[PDB]
Amino acid sequence: QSQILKAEGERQSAFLQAEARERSAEAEARATKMVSEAIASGDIQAVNYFVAQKYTEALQQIGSSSNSKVVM
Amino acid sequence: QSQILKAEGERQSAFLQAEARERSAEAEARATKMVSEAIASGDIQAVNYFVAQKYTEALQQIGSSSNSKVVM
């Protein structure tokens, strides 16, 4: 009996997760459309600049951590 | 007798899991259709930008952890 009750629990959880998945997919679609229009209008170098600066910040935090051993 | 009862338990669990699987597949199909339309309308560089930024965040967290030893 305990196992059957548990299984019913995961079933209901799966249904709720499916609903959340559909909503998140809707949001991703809207985001894709908006950024697609923005890129198609003007240019591509700006996106590369954004990627570069975010990557620079990530690399700085990777280097400046407590546990590491860099080599130049 | 104990083993037979246990086996009945896993049977019922499998049935419930099958129902959940069908629901999740439905959700995946809807998501695929929506994002497919969004991509087919506008462009592909936006998806690459999203992938790049999420990957940058993942790499930053991989580097900035307690147990590691980076090498440059």
How would the blueprint of this fold be written?
This is part of a larger assembly, with 2 copies of chain A (72 residues).
Chain A: H1 2-41, H2 45-63
Subcellular location (chains A, B): Cell inner membrane
Organism (chains A, B): Escherichia coli (strain K12)
Protein name (chains A, B): Protein QmcA
Account of the 3D structure:
The structure is cut from a larger assembly and holds two copies of chain A (72 residues). With 72 residues, the first copy, chain A, is mainly alpha-helical. The first copy, chain A, is built from two helices and no strands. The longest helix of chain A has 40 residues. Chain A is flat and about 60 Å long. At the A-B interface, helix 1 and helix 2 of A face helix 1 and helix 2 of B.
Brief description of this entry?
The structure is cut from a larger assembly and holds two copies of chain A (72 residues). With 72 residues, chain A is an all-alpha fold.
